[PDB]
Amino acid sequence: HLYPGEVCPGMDIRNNLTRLHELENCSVIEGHLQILLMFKTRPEDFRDLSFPKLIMITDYLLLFRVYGLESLKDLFLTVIRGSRLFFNYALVIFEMVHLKELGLYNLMNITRGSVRIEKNNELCYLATIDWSRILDSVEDNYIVLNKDDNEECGDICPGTNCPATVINGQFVERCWTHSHCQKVCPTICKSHGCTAEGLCCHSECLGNCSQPDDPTKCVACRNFYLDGRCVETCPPYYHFQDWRCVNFSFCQDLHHKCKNSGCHQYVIHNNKCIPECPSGYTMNSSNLLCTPCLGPPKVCHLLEGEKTIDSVTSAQELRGCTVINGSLIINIRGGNNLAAELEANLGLIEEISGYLKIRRSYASLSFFRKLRLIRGETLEIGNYSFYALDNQNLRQLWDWSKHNLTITQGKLFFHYNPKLCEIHKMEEVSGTKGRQERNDIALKTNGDSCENELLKFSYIRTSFDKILLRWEPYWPPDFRDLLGFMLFYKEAPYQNVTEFWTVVDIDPPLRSNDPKSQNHPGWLMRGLKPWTQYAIFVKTLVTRTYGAKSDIIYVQTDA
């Protein structure tokens, strides 16, 4: 068989080593494996502890304070699917006091998530791990505070007998331990796998295969598993847990076990055995099918009425949800594809009964693809329905040229958004105009230049040392608002210079009633190197009058 072993539930192991033997027979863990808080352990307690049966993890693997464990090359695994993550990460190693070397030479691929290896004062052979071949995205990896990071590791790969790859421009050998190297398949094999002879496996294998090009000899399937065969999709069988396919009988017994006794009454839709019917379909008692219900979505009642979204695993709880009877707080702190994953998990939300809150989300709010109504039954302190604070890199809320949103009740809030424009547009769209008080929207802490007007230079002359730059006057609808013009110029060796510089402040021209005798603002800057190109543009200043700005021109001095 493809997996000669059994299947086993998600387990938690603590305070002893008697429970670890439960891994004796199960080859694939449907769930997460946690080995944590093992204090009394010693290296003699792990000399003969081996689990060569385990091959694939579905959710993740968390290691936390297993005292006395030095290497995992004798304890364990080829793929960690990562359907459910542990704070964005599928492999968390935290405070492993005595771990010297990872030793997971049998691991090949992580389909979802990242890897964290933190606060390990004895760990080695990190730089000899090529994370690129394992994870599709590697910038999320967070490996600091280790003995390898202190440059105290004598990383001696076997041999040159181990494959070597180029990382950060350096050709370094890859090895897990002093006796095992990193199996690097040919690039043609992609993630299918390669044999000991390097032959690419069948298109449905994942990681490794006992035989090349055969769906019953792999070590782990790529899409789904059935009867010892790896198939792209399963023919009256139904998809289950995104990795294996079970018949109607299996899902039936699962449903019966939980009605006879947290547990989802599993349903069947689109030929998958999934834990709850999606939005807009209903629960058919006769055949467990999802039939299209008329009118009123998937209601997801948040616990305590408030939930904070701090990482991807928190966002996963709201998958498929449509109406959120509660309040949201967004406290994301960094990561890759955050727009992608947050959109994928939360793109189906349409209503928030409570208030929407954004705090310190350092890493646009477009991932709310269908958010349309915010009833605002529950308000933040001060009767606030939308609250946006300390959003360092927030730039856009929504594309109002296409998006629509309505706020039933409550005021808004935007302080300390250095790069956020759109606020007045939101006030117009959501019908909140005339509700915000003073200091509700901070005047200068927000956006500290969303110009929508283009300035045009009127006169240009050059010399070897002096250049005069002249442009068309600007006047806002309230001429008293115009504070001046800012002229920007620097050296520009190439024409790829962006607006993000030497700044010159220029007063507005004297206002004359004669358009023929109109005075145009200009400036003559000196000290310019001869035969040198500069990138130049001018910005207006006003006290919404968005002001005007000028394109980046390139001017060269005389020889």
Binding site: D12, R14, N15, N16, L37, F39, R65, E95, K119
Partner: protein, 46 residues
């Protein structure tokens, strides 16, 4: 003390529970933000 937080909380809980061990079927906001008596500390531990 009275915050017993971070890398100190685990050591403290092991020192107060060196023989009986913790539980599996809140630590921070109960034990880090405010004062944290031995009562809840053992409540967490079996």
């Amino acid at each position: 003390n009275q915050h017993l937080c971070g890398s100190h909380l685990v050591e403290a809980l092991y020192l107060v529970c060196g023989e009986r061990g913790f539980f599996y079927t809140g630590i921070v906001e109960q034990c880090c933000t405010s004062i944290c008596s031995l009562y809840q500390l053992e409540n967490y531990c079996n």
